[PDB]
Amino acid sequence: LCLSQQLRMKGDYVLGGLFPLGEARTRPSSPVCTRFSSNGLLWALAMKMAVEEINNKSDLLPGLRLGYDLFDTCSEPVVAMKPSLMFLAKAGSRDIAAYCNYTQYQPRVLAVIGPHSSELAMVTGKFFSFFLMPQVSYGASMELLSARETFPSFFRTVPSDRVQLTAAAELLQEFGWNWVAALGSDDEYGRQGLSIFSALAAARGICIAHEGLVPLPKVQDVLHQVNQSSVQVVLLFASVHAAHALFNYSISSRLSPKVWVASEAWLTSDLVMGLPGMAQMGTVLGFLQRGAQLHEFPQYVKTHLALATDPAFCSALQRCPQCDCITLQNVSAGLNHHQTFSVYAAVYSVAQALHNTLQCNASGCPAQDPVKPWQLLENMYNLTFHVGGLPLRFDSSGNVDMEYDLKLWVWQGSVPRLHDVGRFNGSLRTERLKIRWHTSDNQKPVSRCSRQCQEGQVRRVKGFHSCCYDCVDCEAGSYRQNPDDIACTFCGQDEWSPERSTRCFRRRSRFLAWGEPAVLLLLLLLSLALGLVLAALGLFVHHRDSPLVQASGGPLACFGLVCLGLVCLSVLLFPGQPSPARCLAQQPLSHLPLTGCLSTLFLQAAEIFVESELPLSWADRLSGCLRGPWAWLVVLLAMLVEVALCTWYLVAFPPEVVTDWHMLPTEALVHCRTRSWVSFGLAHATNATLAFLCFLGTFLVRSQPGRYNRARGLTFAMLAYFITWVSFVPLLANVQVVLRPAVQMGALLLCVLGILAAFHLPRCYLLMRQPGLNT
Amino acid sequence: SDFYLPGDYLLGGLFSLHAMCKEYEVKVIGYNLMQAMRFAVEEINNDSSLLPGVLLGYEIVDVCYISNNVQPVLYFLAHEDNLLPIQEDYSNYISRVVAVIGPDNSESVMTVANFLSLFLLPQITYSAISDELRDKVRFPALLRTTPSADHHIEAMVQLMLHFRWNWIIVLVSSDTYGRDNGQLLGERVARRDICIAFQETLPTLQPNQNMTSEERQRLVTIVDKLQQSTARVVVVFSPDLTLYHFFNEVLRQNFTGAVWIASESWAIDPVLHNLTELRHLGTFLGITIQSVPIPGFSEFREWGTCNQECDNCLNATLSFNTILRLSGERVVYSVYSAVYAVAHALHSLLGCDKSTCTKRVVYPWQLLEEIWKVNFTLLDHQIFFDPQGDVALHLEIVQWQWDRSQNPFQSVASYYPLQRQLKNIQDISWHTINNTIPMSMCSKRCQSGQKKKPVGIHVCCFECIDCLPGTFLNHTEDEYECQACPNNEWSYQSETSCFKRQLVFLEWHEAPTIAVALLAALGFLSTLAILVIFWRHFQTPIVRSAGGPMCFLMLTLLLVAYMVVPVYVGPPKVSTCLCRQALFPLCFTICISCIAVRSFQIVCAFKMASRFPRAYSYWVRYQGPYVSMAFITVLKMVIVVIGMLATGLSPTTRTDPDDPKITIVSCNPNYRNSLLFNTSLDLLLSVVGFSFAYMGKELPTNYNEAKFITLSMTFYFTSSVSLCTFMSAYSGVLVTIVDLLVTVLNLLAISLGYFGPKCYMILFYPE
Ligand SMILES: *[C@@H]1O[C@H](CO)[C@@H](O)[C@H](O)[C@H]1NC(C)=O
Ligand SMILES: *[C@@H]1O[C@H](CO)[C@@H](O)[C@H](O)[C@H]1NC(C)=O
Ligand SMILES: *[C@@H]1O[C@H](CO)[C@@H](O)[C@H](O)[C@H]1NC(C)=O
Ligand SMILES: *[C@@H]1O[C@H](CO)[C@@H](O)[C@H](O)[C@H]1NC(C)=O
Ligand SMILES: *[C@@H]1O[C@H](CO)[C@@H](O)[C@H](O)[C@H]1NC(C)=O
Ligand SMILES: *[C@@H]1O[C@H](CO)[C@@H](O)[C@H](O)[C@H]1NC(C)=O
Ligand SMILES: *[C@@H]1O[C@H](CO)[C@@H](O)[C@H](O)[C@H]1NC(C)=O
Ligand SMILES: *[C@@H]1O[C@H](CO)[C@@H](O)[C@H](O)[C@H]1NC(C)=O
Ligand SMILES: *[C@@H]1O[C@H](CO)[C@@H](O)[C@H](O)[C@H]1NC(C)=O
Ligand SMILES: *[C@@H]1O[C@H](CO)[C@@H](O)[C@H](O)[C@H]1NC(C)=O
Ligand SMILES: *[C@@H]1O[C@H](CO)[C@@H](O)[C@H](O)[C@H]1NC(C)=O
Ligand SMILES: *[C@@H]1O[C@H](CO)[C@@H](O)[C@H](O)[C@H]1NC(C)=O
Ligand SMILES: *[C@@H]1O[C@H](CO)[C@@H](O)[C@H](O)[C@H]1NC(C)=O
Ligand SMILES: *[C@@H]1O[C@H](CO)[C@@H](O)[C@H](O)[C@H]1NC(C)=O
Ligand SMILES: *[C@@H]1O[C@H](CO)[C@@H](O)[C@H](O)[C@H]1NC(C)=O
Ligand SMILES: *[C@@H]1O[C@H](CO)[C@@H](O)[C@H](O)[C@H]1NC(C)=O
């Protein structure tokens, strides 16, 4: 086949060449690569095609022949250094001198078509820059190769990583995902991409939740860190292998779908593209290059393969010894490869720079001394060269300018396809109406941070950089002591705080005040009860000699009326500010006169019972003694036993004026509280026993029609007492604590009203209206 | 000049004399290392035990920081006629130099090693800490005399661990050095339970030039974000050139209280210490190589083509002579050891026997092969190359001291790369009030018995939330979540040890229960005496007109109820509650039904006989009271069985609100509804019984039966109302004793108010 024999071509000016024609110590011998690479041979044939087409054209380099030296460079730099030294050696000689500067050198090649790999491009460019040899590199993309301080003679025909990373940052900012996670492959490509994206995101307001490096074929930690933050957009700027490993592991672990912003490395790679289960990992929006394709390259390469198969031509006429023992189907896999255009345009750019340096027209091109390689640089900046009808330019930093296309993946029948939904020519312009997202509906996945926290909130720094604050609302009872505080601080437990508040508010007491409507209604009831008591007392003291009061006690009746009035008056001390003496004396002063009245009614009941259901033999002794001085002694004994019990449970059971700091929501409480059911229960025991005995001795009696029923009043008074207090107890047990004294008051007032209306009212009715029955 | 010395075997050098190279400003460290190499070669020439009779020369070429890294190497590999041949195999090639002492920075070393890989010339670089030089696949002929950045990061991490700093701040530079160091430290620190608050890139800004407004905003943003954070350990991976502006603006913003940790780049930089205003920022630690005192070198240093000259070097080194002398030599020993390593390798390659040498031609690859295997001693230090091309020189953490009377950089720690251990730490003069270790923790230590709750992505940051009542925290198992105590025992707030709830119930020896027992015993004795008396007098109108068998069965059932009263007190078991609820309600309801039916048949039967004659005839032909008694009794067993099926049988455990420490035990899990139903039935019977008695209250009947029935039934009504109101207004430990009191007093009512007057008129009224 002898295809490798054409790798040289004599000419007035000869170009270099560094292609990956091959693939993969103690002695200083260059390793030899025997494995054959189809891409490298395709690129070398592309540059040969470009040179041949240049020689065909009469308007470009007229009357001149351009040559080439297509040299094999494996991905290793050790095998690529020797062709560089061969390039810089003097033509026709096999040694390179070590002069002080470039001007003494006469390199055998006008320019060099640099290596495809960027790791090799770094070393090759740093070596060439000392001699100022013009180098145009297809495929070298990472940004720091554009630093003119260290690469004054290094150009390129592919866009740098800076433009696509700027496109990705503009995409994230335009769709609004200002809280994203950045990932990169473990090699230099991913690290440079992460650094550039860090700078661009910091410039554009985007924050990176987590910056991690996915290892080349660990991953578990990176995925856990990404999932720890609530991030739904992940920029994966990785090589093909790292992205494939990441996606395979995420397939095994069943990660939630995310919007992976794809680098050009794995956006169009079929290994990642055809991974099983990949459809369940959200949309993949990448920025594919928008570059033309050689529409006649496959025909050219097939023609020259067939022509080199012919022995006559090649016989009439190493670098790649494996390139001779190849056939057409060993290369057909990559005919539609987009680096062919990069190589083609690099060759055209070098030729146009040479043509401009010779400053010569289309008809001819004047004779002169051969131009030094370093003389091309002055004319290859600002260079404008047309490659297949499309103009291209070299920036001041040796980077060509071309636009991009925002391509996303679609899914039908597990067959992913690329679709154009945007264009980045320095200003992103997307068509988001047609974008189909992975969410349950066609809604953009929200992934956003709070740049600032709203007033009245605590701020917590998030992100790998201190970018955005996780604004947190904390419940009531707390306040933001300082703007810089991470968490809100509680206040002194004696003052309430509302939700979402900068400061606490002081708790103010709210007890049963004299102005409350319940207090007003009970005061009106108290005034009515006092009026009734006073009217009955006046009636009983005016008709004191009448048989009515004489049978119904006498002075005892007036004493009981005064006791009822004094109970009504002592009801008045319950409300207001709970002074300690007032709260202590509530029960005794509300119970002593009630005890006296109950004892008087009980003596009346006992007299009735003795005269009703006892033998006359005992009656003649009991009736004559139960009334008079012995009656006064009995009621006095009741009063003193009540007073002794009262002092006993005031000295033993302490009635405390507690201040419930945590009962009402926004206001304080001042509660007069005593022992549960024991204090007032023991206080009520004597009254309960007196009333029970009175009821028992009265509620059976013989009421002959010729006599006044002196028992009905007592029975209904005792019944009213019992029912009102029995209904009162659950009211005490369930009423809201502020109205507890009001419930106490109601119990006492209804007690007095019941005893009046049952016992004294029927007597007074006939005392005033029908005095014909007082015989 | 001093840049050339002819000999049998030259030894090239590469030193950064400026930062053509002549127009740049002069650097003192480059000339210092140059003199170090010259002294090393000269002392090799002196020593007759090492390389005897073989003169060793050198060829030193000035290289800039970056600019000049290609021409000197080509000069090194050129022949004596300045021509470098090109060929496939270089085993027969003889280079001008035999070895080269590589540049002082990572990038120029990388370039020189990439270009020298073809020839395999040995290259012992110094002070190049990048880890990409660790692998020999792409740098076959590269060595070092300085531990890699791996050991610098390890020393930093050990220093943080020793002083308990788990919340730090990383600042890097836009260069590759800062980025690689930051990534390396971030990867190292994630496995030692130390978190990074944030990592920020300092913009590159060389001094002696004016900054832009955008860079000023950048720096003020950096220091604002630094100050607002609670981390107080700031590691900086940045070359010493660009740290002037950052520290100036830090001083401007008046930010204090940070423990700055310095990488090897600016840990020994003199100018930053010369700024002499950083002393108020805090402590300034740094990582640098141990200083090895080289004998007879200070006096030697003081005695003294293109890009191969310097003129202002001596004048510049004159000013920094005292600080260099007091600070010792840090990178000088690296060059000294590298030159001795080449010398020992060449001496072993020639096979010299300390008297004679074969003087054979040396190929550089042979020298590399020999130099990979050198192991000698030098100033009490072992010099041997690890398989990845490094020698374990002790590192050192140095704390800047702002006093010119002693060393400006005073050592406080020593790091041994072989053991990866940092040890021998001395006192460090901190920036705190009473010389206490600065605290750099993000989350305070939780109080004993308090749950840990993560607050963010960082594992070391958390919030302490106390365990709710009823649970504790088992620190041994898991400190992130509370673990409740089983076996029905309760725990208080912030308690790590659950305590068993003591079981409180009715015990025989207590005051209320002994009062109840005495009262029930009095009732039992009285009713037993009543039965004895009633059996003593029969065929008597009171016991014959009234129900004889009725009264006898009533009194026997009352005896049974009194005898089973004491089963209530004691441990509540299944049989206890079964017998209790099968005897007490049954007997009491049967008593109430008998009382009601007796009152009915003595009062309302006469009135009913007028309206329904055949109903009265059926009632008298059969035993109406007996059949009604049986009907009410079977209704009662039915209702008690259905309540049985509803509320269950096992004794229950309920936690009273008074004290969770105690746990009262009743036998009915739902006691409120059960007692409500029982009292509802009892009162539904009671109302009709009482009304029947009251309508015929004055009738003499069977010796005033209606009156005593009425009084007893009203007493029961009041007692039941008292029970209802007490239960509605109270729920606690005394519920059981109150139930006993009310039940026994109801039994006393039924006994006394219906049988006591009978005994009264039998004993005292025999007429
Ligand atoms: C150059 O032109 C010749 C005819 O003169 C043609 O055969 C050949 O294919 C051309 N080379 C190209 C198109 O590369
Ligand atoms: C290169 O070095 C030579 C030495 O003779 C000098 O004359 C010439 O000006 C230099 N050229 C440069 C620095 O461009
Ligand atoms: C990811 O995070 C979510 C939300 O916190 C969590 O439920 C889930 O277990 C995590 N892991 C995976 C593999 O989804
Ligand atoms: C994908 O991940 C699984 C689970 O970790 C692993 O076993 C497998 O080897 C991976 N697939 C490939 C093709 O490497
Ligand atoms: C050509 O393809 C055949 C068939 O796959 C293969 O065996 C042969 O090695 C290839 N030739 C190369 C790679 O030079
Ligand atoms: C252009 O230059 C060529 C070569 O010197 C010359 O022959 C020709 O006349 C010039 N002008 C035009 C219009 O071609
Ligand atoms: C050449 O580049 C320079 C850079 O300063 C620019 O000013 C000039 O306009 C350019 N010339 C062109 C684009 O023709
Ligand atoms: C980019 O293309 C847009 C249209 O999408 C156009 O308006 C704009 O001028 C272009 N910008 C550049 C810098 O070419
Ligand atoms: C030894 O080295 C010293 C410097 O260290 C030098 O001055 C002297 O000439 C050398 N030779 C002898 C014999 O001292
Ligand atoms: C900026 O720096 C320059 C260079 O030293 C100096 O002359 C100038 O005064 C500085 N300030 C301003 C405001 O330009
Ligand atoms: C201290 O901080 C304040 C506030 O930023 C600043 O104005 C001042 O210059 C700083 N220095 C001194 C010495 O007060
Ligand atoms: C050393 O620091 C001092 C103190 O600020 C300074 O004045 C001097 O310029 C610095 N440099 C020297 C002495 O080289
Ligand atoms: C050092 O500086 C002095 C003046 O202080 C000057 O006379 C001398 O020439 C300088 N030495 C040099 C530049 O080598
Ligand atoms: C170097 O030799 C010393 C002394 O015998 C020995 O302790 C040390 O282990 C040796 N080192 C190596 C790497 O063999
Ligand atoms: C440090 O020393 C002072 C003076 O003795 C002492 O009062 C003070 O408590 C110490 N400081 C601290 C923070 O313990
Ligand atoms: C707590 O953890 C220890 C240690 O594993 C275990 O033995 C114990 O049972 C756990 N529970 C308690 C209540 O101590």
Q: Which residues pair with A392 in a beta bridge?
A: A385
CA-nearest of B182, B125, B130, B177 to B156 is B182
CA distances from B252 to A665, B203, B248, B274 (A): 49, 18, 6, 17
Q: Amino acid identity of A707?
A: R
What distance in Å separates the CA atoms of residue A651 and residue B436, rounded to the nearest whole number?
A: 57
| Cβ within 8 Å of A, B 300-339 | 305-307
Q: How many C-alpha atoms does A310 have within 13 Å on its Cβ side?
A: 9
Task: List all residues 6 or more positions away from A747 whose beta carbon is below 8 Å from its beta carbon.
Answer: A724, A725, A728, A731, A732
A723 contacts: CB under 8 Å, gap ≥ 6: none
At A432, which amino acid appears?
A: R
Residue A766: what residue type? Answer: L
Beta carbons of B45 and B93 less than 8 angstroms apart: no
Closest CA to B706 of B716, B715, B714, B696: B696
| Minimum CA–CA partner of B179 in chain A | A195
Q: Which helix (H) or strand (E) holds B756?
A: helix B735-763
Nearest CA to ligand 3 atom 3: A227
Least CA distance to A87: which residue of chain B? B86
Cα(A208) to centroid(ligand 8), Å: 29
Whether A746 contacts A565, CB under 8 Å? no
List the structure tokens of A511: 């007890």
Calculate the CA dihedral of residues A106, A107, A108, A112 and round it to 10 degrees. Answer: -150
Left (φ > 0), alpha (ψ -120 to 50) or beta: where does A359 sit?
left
Any A CB within 8 A of B199 CB: yes
Which 58-97 residues of chain B touch chain A by CB within 8 A?
Answer: 66, 69-71, 74-75, 77-78, 82-91, 93
**Element of type H or E holding B722:** helix B705-728
Strands of A415-424's sheet, edge to edge?
A207-214, A179-185, A233-237, A259-262, A284-289, A404-412, A415-424, A428-430
The ligand that comes nearest to the alpha carbon of residue B485 is: 16
* Cβ-contact A162, A237 below 8 angstroms: no
- Which of A310, A449, A587, A27 lies closest to B366 in space, CA to CA? A27
The Cα B595–Cα B590 span in angstroms is: 9
Closest residue in B to A459 (Cα) is B228
* Residue A370 exposed, middle or buried by CB count within 10 Å (0-12, 13-18, 19+): exposed
Find all residues with CB under 8 Å of A327, minimum gap 6, and list them.
Answer: none
Cα B168 to Cα B190, B192, B201, B221, B258: the distances in Å are 12, 13, 15, 18, 10
d(CA B389, CA B375): 13
Q: Is B377 in the pocket of ligand 14 (CB under 6 A)?
A: no
CB distance from A692 to chain B under 8 Å? yes
Centre of ligand 15 to C-alpha B164, Å, is 22
Atom of ligand 14 nearest to the CA of B375: 1
Q: How many CA atoms lie within 13 A of B584 on its CB side?
A: 23
Beta-carbon contacts of A474 under 8 Å, excluding residues fewer than 6 positions away, are A458, A487, A488
**A4 CB neighbour count, 10 Å cutoff:** 21
Distance CA A177, CA A230 (A): 12
Q: Which H, E and C letters describe A492-551, residue by residue?
A: CCCEECCCCCCCCEECCECCCCCCCHHHHHHHHHHHHHHHHHHHHHHHHHHCCCCHHHHH
Q: Please compute Rg for chain A using Cα positions.
A: 54
Note whether B466 and B476 are within 8 A (CB). no
Residues in a beta bridge with A184: A213, A237
Task: Give yes or no for residue B375 CB within 6 A of ligand 14.
Answer: yes
For an interface test with A, give the residue of B67, B119, B183, B185 to mutate (most A CBs within 10 A): B183
CA distances from B613 to A194, A498, B607, B609, B622 (A): 111, 79, 11, 5, 14
Minimal Cα–Cα distance from A229 to chain B, Å? 7
Which residues are within 8 A (CB) of A254 and not within 5 positions of it... i.e. 6 or more apart?
A: none
Distance of CA A765 from the midpoint of ligand 11 (Å): 94
* A342, A78 contact by CB (below 8 A): no
A119 — phi, psi (to 5°)?
-65, -35
Best CATH choice for the domain B4-146+295-328+331-393 from the list 3.40.50.150, 3.40.50.2300, 1.10.10.10, 3.30.70.260: 3.40.50.2300
For the record, the structure tokens of B312 come out as 């202002």
Strand, coil or helix: B401: coil
> Does the Cβ of A470 fall within 6 Å of ligand 1?
no
What is the phi/psi pair of residue B394, to 5°?
Answer: -60, 130
Q: Which CATH architecture is the domain A4-158+294-393 placed in?
A: 3-Layer(aba) Sandwich (3.40)
CB B28 within 8 A of CB B313: yes
- A719 and chain B in contact, CB less than 8 A: no
Q: Which amino acid is at B627?
A: V
**What is the three-class DSSP state of B128?**
coil
Query: What would the two tokens of residue B721 be?
Result: 């109302």
The pair phi, psi for residue B604, each rounded to 5°, is: -85, -15
Q: What share of chain B is helix, strand, coil (3-state, %, to 5)?
A: 45, 15, 40
Residues in chain B: 767
Q: Nearest residue CA, atom 7 of ligand 5?
A: A330
Closest CA to B462 of B200, B156, B166: B166
Distance of CA B625 to the CA centre of its chain: 78
Which residue of chain A comes nearest to B694, CA vs CA? A700
In DSSP terms, B462 is beta-bridged to B454
DSSP annotation string for B470-519: TEE--TTT-SSS-EE--TT-B--TT-SS-BPPEEE---SSSHHHHHHHHH
Q: Which atom of ligand 15 is nearest to the CA of B436?
A: 13
Helix orientation angle between A580-613 and A679-698, rounded to the nearest 10 degrees = 20
Positions of CATH 1.20.1070 in chain A: 517-651+689-700+718-768
* Cα B685 → chain centroid: 67
Q: Please give the Cα distance from A499 to A497 (Å, whole number).
A: 7
Burial tier of A584 (Cβ tally within 10 Å: 0-12, 13-18, 19+): middle
Tell me the nearest-neighbour CA distance from B740 into chain A, angstroms. 19
Helices (H) and strands (E) in chain B, counts: 22, 24
- Are the Cβ atoms of B77 and A460 closer than 8 angstroms? no
- Beta bridge partners, A522, equal none
Max CA separation in chain B (angstroms)? 164
Distance between Cα B223 and ligand 11 center (Å)? 14
Count of C-beta atoms within a 10 Å radius of residue B654? 11
What is the residue whose two structure tokens read 């933001």? A480
Instruction: Give the C-alpha separation, A508 to A40, whole Å.
Output: 87
Q: How far apart are CA B479 and CA B462, in angstroms?
A: 12
Burial bucket for residue A166 (CB in 10 Å: 0-12, 13-18, 19+): buried
CA nearest neighbour of B159 among B187, B129, B192? B192
The Cβ-side half-sphere exposure at A356, using a 13 Å CA radius, reads 17
Q: How many degrees, rounded to 5, is the angle at CA A234 between CA A228 and CA A236?
A: 125
Nearest to A190 by CA among A159, A215, A168: A215
Cα–Cα distance measured from residue A744 to residue B308, given in angstroms and rounded to the nearest whole number: 109
Ligand closest in space to the Cα of B256: 11
Whether chain B has a CB inside 8 Å of the CB on A218: the answer is: no
Nearest CA to ligand 12 atom 2: B274
Structure letter (DSSP) for residue A627: S
- DSSP 3-state of A297: helix
- Cα–Cα distance between A126 and B107 in angstroms, integer? 11
For residue A191, list chain B residues with Cβ-Cβ distance below 8 A. Answer: 179-180, 183
Q: How many CB atoms lie within 10 A of CB A587?
A: 22
- Protein residue whose Cα sits closest to atom 5 of ligand 1: A56
- C-beta of residue B268 within 8 angstroms of C-beta of residue B7: no
Q: Please give the single-letter amino acid code of residue A724.
A: T
Contact A231, A259 (CB under 8 A): no
Gap between the Cα atoms of A598 and A683, Å rounded: 14
Distance between CA atoms of residues B170 and B189, nearest Å? 11
Task: Please name the residue ranges forming H helices in B350-483.
Answer: 364-371
| Method of structure determination | cryo-EM
Residue (of A556, A599, A754) closest to A689 by Cα position = A599
CA–CA distance, B105 with B19 (Å, rounded to integer): 12
Place of tokens 């180098």: A135
Contact predicate B308/B62, CB 8 Å: yes
Q: Mapping DSSP to helix (H, G, I), strand (E, B) and coil, where does residue B259 land?
A: strand
Query: Residue B76 in contact with residue B121, Cβ under 8 Å?
Result: yes
Q: Describe the crossing of helices B243-253 and B213-228 by its angle, rounded to 10 degrees.
A: 60
Cα(B198)–Cα(B193) distance, integer angstroms? 15
Helix (H) or strand (E) holding B528: helix B511-536
User: What six digits make up the tokens of A420?
Assistant: 């154009």
Q: Do B711 and A96 touch (CB under 8 A)?
A: no
Partner-chain residue, chosen from B85, B93, B115, that has the shortest CB–CB distance to A81: B115
Strand A428-430 relative to strand A415-424, pairing: antiparallel
Q: Tell whether B169 lies on the interface with A, counting CB pairs under 8 A.
A: no
Q: What is the DSSP string of A348-361?
A: HHHHHHHHHHTT--
| Contact between residue A113 and residue A47 where contact means Cβ atoms under 8 Å apart | yes
User: Regarding beta strands A207-214 and A179-185, do their DSSP bridges make them parallel or antiparallel, or are they unpaired?
Assistant: parallel
Residues of chain B contacting A700 with CB distance shorter than 8 Å: 697, 707, 710-711
Q: Cα angle vertex B611, ends B605, B612, to 5°?
A: 75
- B229, B197 contact by CB (below 8 A): yes
Return the SS3 of B364.
helix
Q: Angle at the Cα of B73 (from B70 to B77), degrees rounded to 5?
A: 140
Q: Say if CB B21 and CB B63 are below 8 A apart.
A: yes
Closest partner residue to B710 (CB to CB) among A26, A464, A700 is A700
Do domains B443-500 and B511-763 share one topology? The answer is no
Q: Report how far residue B265's alpha carbon sits from residue B271's, in angstroms, rounded to the nearest whole number.
A: 12
Token representation of residue A157: 């025909």
For the domain spanning A161-289+404-430, the CATH number is 3.40.50.2300
**If you ran DSSP here, which 8-state letter would residue A182 be given?**
E
Contacts of B75 in chain A (CB under 8 A): 98
| Nearest one of B552, B591, B574 to B685, comparing CA atoms | B591
Q: Closest by alpha carbon to A95, among B765, B402, B206, B87? A: B87
Q: Which residues of B touch A464 (CB under 8 A)?
A: 198-199
Distances in whole angstroms, Cα of residue B192 to Cα of each of B51, B258, B447 = 48, 21, 24
Pocket lining: A366 vs ligand 6, CB cutoff 6 Å: yes
Q: Whose CA is nearest to atom 4 of ligand 15?
A: B434
Cβ-Cβ contacts under 8 Å, B118 against chain A:
28, 30, 78, 81-82
Report angle CA B588, B594, B599 to the nearest 5 degrees: 130
Q: Which two tokens stand for residue B502?
A: 């003591």
Per-residue tokens: B182: 């930051």
Is A97 in contact with B456 (Cβ distance < 8 A)?
no
Atom 2 in ligand 8: residue holding the nearest Cα: A425
Burial class (CB in 10 A: 0-12, 13-18, 19+), B41: buried
Q: Where are the alpha helices (DSSP H) in B144-280?
A: 149-162, 176-189, 213-228, 243-253, 270-274
Tokens 């502020």, residue? A738
Contacts of A732 in chain B (CB under 8 A): 729
Distance in angstroms (rounded) separating the CA atoms of residues A220 and A226:
10
Residue A323 DSSP symbol: G
Give, rounded to a whole angstrom, the gap between the first and last alpha carbons of chain B.
Answer: 159
Nearest to A501 by CA among A469, A473, A471: A473
CATH number corresponding to B149-292+401-423 = 3.40.50.2300
Please work out, in degrees rounded to the nearest 5, the angle formed at the alpha carbon of residue A172 by the alpha carbons of A170 and A177: 145
| Class of the CATH-defined domain B443-500 | mainly beta
- CB atoms < 10 A from the CB of B456, how many? 18
Give the residues across from B381 on adjacent strands: B378
| Interface contact B230, partner A, CB < 8 A | yes
Q: What CATH number should be reported for the domain whose range is A517-651+689-700+718-768?
A: 1.20.1070
How far apart (Å, rounded) are the C-alpha atoms in residues A700 and A672?
Answer: 42
Residues 6+ apart with CB under 8 A from B346: B9, B51, B54, B56, B98, B362, B367, B370
- Say how many C-beta atoms besides its own lie within 10 A of residue B39's C-beta: 20
State both tokens at A27: 């002695």
- Asked if residue A365 has its Cβ within 6 Å of ligand 6, the reply is yes
Where in the sequence of chain A do the CATH 3.40.50.2300 domains occur?
A: 4-158+294-393, 161-289+404-430
Phi, psi of B396 (to 5 degrees): -165, 130
Q: Cα(A221)–Cα(A227) distance, rounded to whole angstroms?
A: 10
To the nearest whole Å, the CA of B478 is away from the closest chain A CA by 20
Tokens of A141: 């993309």
Please tell me the distance from the alpha carbon of residue B308 to that of residue A545, in angstroms, as a whole number.
Answer: 145
Whole-angstrom Cα distance, residue B243 to residue B284? 14
* Of residues A117, A110, A102, A99, the one with CA closest to residue A135: A110
**With contact defined as beta carbons under 8 Å apart, do B520 and B745 qualify?**
no
Q: At which residue do the structure tokens 């730099």 appear?
A: A77
Rounded to 5°, the CA angle A154-A156-A158 comes to 155
Domain residues of chain B, as ranges? 4-146+295-328+331-393, 149-292+401-423, 443-500, 511-763
* SS3 state at B453: strand
Q: Is the dihedral of CA B446, B450, B452, B455 positive or negative?
A: negative
Q: How far apart are CA B157 and CA B194, in angstroms?
A: 9
Q: Kindly report the protein residue whose alpha carbon is nearest to atom 2 of ligand 15.
A: B434
Find the ligand nearest to B432 CA. Answer: 15
- Is the domain defined by B511-763 classed in CATH 3.40.50.300? no
Answer whether A487 sits within 8 Å of B84, measured CB to CB. Answer: no
Beta strand pairing call for A259-262 and A284-289: parallel
Under 8 Å between Cβ of A247 and A409: no
DSSP B659: -
Whole-number Å distance between alpha carbons of B84 and A89: 9
Q: How many CB atoms lie within 10 A of CB B392?
A: 18
Instruction: Pick A86's closest partner by Cβ from B86, B115, B307.
Output: B86
Q: A381: Cβ–Cβ under 8 A, 6 or more apart, which residues?
A: A394, A396, A398
Counting every residue, how long is chain A? 775
